[PDB]
Amino acid sequence: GNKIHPIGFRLGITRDWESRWYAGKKQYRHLLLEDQRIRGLLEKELYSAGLARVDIERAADNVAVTVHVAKPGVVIGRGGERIRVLREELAKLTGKNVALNVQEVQNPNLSAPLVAQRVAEQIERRFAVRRAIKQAVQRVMESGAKGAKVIVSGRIGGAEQARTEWAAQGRVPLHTLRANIDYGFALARTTYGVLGVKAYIFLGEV
Template sequence: MGQKVNPIGLRLGINRNWTSRWFPGSQITPSSILEDHKIRKFLKKELYYAGVSEIIIEKAAKKLRVTVVAARPGLIIGKKGADIEKVKETLKKIVQKEVAINIKEVKRPQADAQLAAESVATQLERRVAFRRAMKKVMQAAMKSGAKGIKVKVSGRLAGAEMARTEWYMEGRVPLHTLRAKIDYGFAEAMTTYGIIGVKVWIFKGEVLHKGIQVEKKEEATREERPKTRRGRQ
């Protein structure tokens, strides 16, 4: 089961928290979910250049707080906060509420799964060979302290007539271990041959109930496993 489901959703309440934090009544739940979707879609499009990893939305009765976790926060804020004010005003028009925006920096961008997936997708759109793009991201993640990484691409790879799936893995990625801190990211590359899906799993260590990081004395063995499967998943 751990191989199929979203690893973030599987670990909610264990070592991951929800990215939408609000408690509406049953009648307004659908509209609140749609509102969250619009906020995320707008911010992803507007702040794409800043490398947005995560968007956390917190709602009160008449106020909305949005926390944007990005690799380059300075580009979001702009000179004297001018750019962030423009974003805030646009969000006010979308949600019709008072909006507060917090910006956080990603400590290790190379070990962030969402940023890694978007990096591979960007390289594929620039016609970089998919194997080269995958291995480049994997090497950067392992150098920045990741315990393991798995990258999977699906679609018409290298312009092939039949879609297929290929993946590479280095180190350990224990998807069935619930205490394992697994970061997951997904992105799509819009190529001339069609859409190529990119999925990235990054293992950052095991977390106990008290939040203690378990360090292994022996280093994880490095391995690369090229796999091919015909058809799309």
């Protein structure tokens, strides 16, 4: 049972909405759908850049997609011939003229979505889970951070009986709103099932 989404809980304060636009009760439904299509075409094609998040904003018909990736190299390409292809491939699903931006991630080891995303990929490359997690945490703790915590789900190691592996140090104060705890979930499509990687990263206070 237990434990609400540490994002959706803090959504009020310490964390703001991924897509932040306004729409009436005859539009909201449509903008939302297309907004989703963008995230889908984005999370698939930009995997290599490792996209932490995608901010989307709207106004006088136009749409300001502000992609946050660790390596903006892979979204630019031939000095452009990639950020053009993708601002183009968005122009088809969105008939409304898009504007793709790219945001550097100073510290991939301070964005929970990426940390988790990291762990996920190892588990498919059959890394040792226990270490992966203790390591992943350290890489996050070494990069500043007031605290951090990772969680791998079940079937660690092909093991017939699903388990759960842990690791976490510093403070990770879940019930305090005044927190800022980036959360990130990564899936791990292994040969013998699926695994879930949850990553918590505490930082700052007020």
